[PDB]
A paper describes a structure:
Aminoacyl-tRNA synthetases (AARSs) attach amino acids to their corresponding tRNA adaptors with high specificity in an essential reaction of protein synthesis. TARS is secreted from endothelial cells in response to TNF-α and VEGF, and potently stimulates angiogenesis in the human umbilical vein endothelial cell (HUVEC) tube formation and chicken chorioallantoic membrane assays. The isolation of resistant bacterial strains2627 and Chinese hamster ovary cell lines with selective gene amplification demonstrated that the principal target of borrelidin in bacteria and eukaryotes is threonyl-tRNA synthetase.
As a first step towards understanding the molecular basis of these effects, we co-crystallized BC194 with a fragment of human TARS comprising the catalytic and anticodon binding domains, and solved the structure to a resolution of 2.8 Å. The structures of BN and BC194 differ at position C17, with BN containing a pendant cyclopentanecarboxylic acid ring, and BC194 a cyclobutanecarboxylic acid ring. BC194 binding to the TARS active site is stabilized by numerous Van der Waals interactions and five distinct enzyme-compound hydrogen bonds. In addition, BC194 induces a conformation of TARS close to that of BN – TARS complex, with an r.m.s.d. of 0.62 Å between superimposed BC194 and BN – TARS complex structures (for all 402 Ca’s in TARS). The key structural difference that differentiates how BN and BC194 interact with TARS is seen in the contacts made to the respective pendant rings. A strong hydrogen bond normally found in the BN complex is eliminated, and the hydrophobic interaction between the cyclopentane ring and A592 is also weakened. The loss of the interactions with these two residues suggests that BC194 may compete less effectively against threonine for binding than the parent compound BN.
Author numbering:
A (entry chain A), B (entry chain B): 321 to 723
The structure:
Amino acid sequence: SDHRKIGRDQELYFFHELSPGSCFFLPKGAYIYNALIEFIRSEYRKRGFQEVVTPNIFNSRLWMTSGHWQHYSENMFSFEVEKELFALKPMNCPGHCLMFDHRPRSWRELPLRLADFGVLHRNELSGALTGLTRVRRFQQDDAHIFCAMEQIEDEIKGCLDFLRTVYSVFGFSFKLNLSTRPEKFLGDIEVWDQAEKQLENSLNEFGEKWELNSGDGAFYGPKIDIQIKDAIGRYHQCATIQLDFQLPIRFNLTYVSHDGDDKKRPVIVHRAILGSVERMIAILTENYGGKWPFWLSPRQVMVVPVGPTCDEYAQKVRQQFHDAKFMADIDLDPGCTLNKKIRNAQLAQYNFILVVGEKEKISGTVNIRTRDNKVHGERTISETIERLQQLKEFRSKQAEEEF
Amino acid sequence: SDHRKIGRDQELYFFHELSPGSCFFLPKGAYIYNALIEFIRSEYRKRGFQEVVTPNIFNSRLWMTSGHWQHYSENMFSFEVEKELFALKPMNCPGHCLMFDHRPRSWRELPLRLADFGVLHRNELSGALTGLTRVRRFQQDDAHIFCAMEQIEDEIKGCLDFLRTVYSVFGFSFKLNLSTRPEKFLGDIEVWDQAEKQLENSLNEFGEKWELNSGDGAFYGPKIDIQIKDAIGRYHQCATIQLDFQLPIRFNLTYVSHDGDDKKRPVIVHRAILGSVERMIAILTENYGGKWPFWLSPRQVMVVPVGPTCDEYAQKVRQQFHDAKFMADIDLDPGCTLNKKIRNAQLAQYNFILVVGEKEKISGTVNIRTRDNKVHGERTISETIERLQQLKEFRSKQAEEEF
Ligand SMILES: C[C@@H]1C[C@H](C)C[C@H](C)[C@@H](O)CC(=O)O[C@H]([C@@H]2CC[C@H]2C(=O)O)CCC/C=C(\C#N)[C@H](O)[C@@H](C)C1
Ligand SMILES: C[C@@H]1C[C@H](C)C[C@H](C)[C@@H](O)CC(=O)O[C@H]([C@@H]2CC[C@H]2C(=O)O)CCC/C=C(\C#N)[C@H](O)[C@@H](C)C1
Ligand SMILES: [Zn+2]
Ligand SMILES: [Zn+2]
């Protein structure tokens, strides 16, 4: 089960030597892409996240401040503009630190959750590059939570909840591990201790088992790492919750508290769930075997007529399903058998096959078979649309069966 | 007047030393961004356009093939990756040419309209840079039509229609210009002749007033230039329709005709309407004077309660408007006058101010005032939401008046 082959055969995405580590998404794959993105966006609008758009290149002084030239230079594409150094952003964080520092901010605005889907480029060796799993270019579901030390606990709760929701939609399971302060660390030990206290507390509060790795954290902060398990029984590292006490210092971030102190530093929480959209597309592709849930599927409805007798009506049907914002196609080919068309639609992984006969044209109705050839028998166009939009909006895992 | 200042005061967008020629979009400005993108997308789905996702960086051989090295190299950021030259994409065209050549294609698949919102980088001199008007990083509403020479006529009709529709929503006028074959040109004269014939043909068919700039066309094709006029009386060059015969040659693109003849070349139509999203954001900012139409507005509804007595009933109201996918805020400050709150809300360019009193909490209603201060008096939450939804969907140029 390979996402590259399945990628080619469904005309989702392909690859080319002219841009190694970067992907070409054909319209269907692009649909899947934007579908994932807007899923995350809906959840954002539930959870109080605010999306921003940031520059893709920056002067060397920013990667100076952030710690990227000292630490990350190898992975970064750099070039010289007007005698000054510039680089493509490997991460969204420093830009967001700039957005936070744009104007004086008070305690009233915290927690401030800034989200970015912006394009990230990382330099990775040509022989290391494979498919969508290891890539140079990717879009990440990225967010930074700026908060007071004390809000952190609640924030983490939210974070965990967020994860659950998303993965509950995919049907994935997950494992949690707490990586605490290592021997090599930068910061004030008190800050570390309170932070880790809150992390542990919200972890227990969450109610699910976790392991404590004791010193496997980073030098700039403690972290909660999350492993997801798919239906094939594969384990993936996708989501992350990473605290940062360093970045607010390096960029000199401050906020007004309620007791008047304006010199207070915030805590930065780097958070991601899907990881990168690309790698998540790979994972989902292999996990589903190319057989997509209705809400995620670039091929949703396939309209078939019984004969040229009634194409006019298939056309009207398909159009009515198109304006309902479904991905819907039609097979008008006179040189094909009805059974052959249905079989091809089911091989093309169309979730629902709507067959139209004479009774179908006369009564203003459609007849329904499924990708797995279940015949849900005859329905009104209105009813079919309503039920399908229910199964879409709720992102049902098996739609065909539950219809 | 000036979009930079307005961008600062409304917390839409700002600029920074560390990335000249790029932009920082705060949540509000970002909302505007994605709103424009979504508008163009809806119209795409009406008009049979298919969106794709393409790589941001490419090997130098691509830019050599398309001809950007021998021409456009001065505007391109280039850098070395593993001994080889690479560059960020100034345009989406070559990538789309790659996507066309991915597999064999027939006449049945034409016209094939591929759309890209992808991020483009062009190198502009630091002294040339001003705001969002002249930039380095920008996202373009970009599309390439691949069509048979004949279909071109009909296609242009569509293009024209599309322009009209979009600008009908904005309220801009436009003047049309046909730029034809220059003295220095590359191609077969007969191809040029037929193409220009069809162009003039659809131009007259459209019913609008167009002008003939014989000779001022590109060396690689004839073009229709469009100038938009706003409400300040400024003319802008944003939208373009550009024929390309050269690109299919250089990338060796073919298609199976219904003859059985596969050696026929497609014509490429480069098309943009908004130009770049950034440019259009600037234009709209200065055109609206920072006062946005209801559908484009990051500040739509502000809920104001009179007394803390019902701070909470407004919590409820603002929540119900938030789940209707409106951009809605609330003013709970006990240290402010009702009047001061209202006029602050209108100075902030909030489209609708919902004042909430005791009677309103009792009868489950709201009382409506307007950014310009009109007053629509009590109305129930339901019909208020429905009316605002209609005014959002139809994209009313004035919601405030027509509510
Ligand atoms: C610039 C260095 C680079 C470090 C050393 C990178 C290491 C490889 C790990 O620390 C990476 C990591 O987990 O980053 C984390 C990313 C979130 C998912 C992961 C991701 O995007 O991969 C986030 C950390 C961002 C950190 C910073 C920033 N800015 C830090 O202040 C600076 C000091 C970090
Ligand atoms: C490499 C040259 C660049 C030309 C010489 C530069 C000129 C300034 C204009 O030709 C640019 C232009 O109007 O391009 C047009 C762009 C659409 C809006 C405009 C836009 O994006 O600005 C479209 C043309 C793309 C063209 C190609 C490609 N690929 C051509 O085959 C090659 C020859 C283009
Ligand atoms: Zn981060
Ligand atoms: Zn183009």
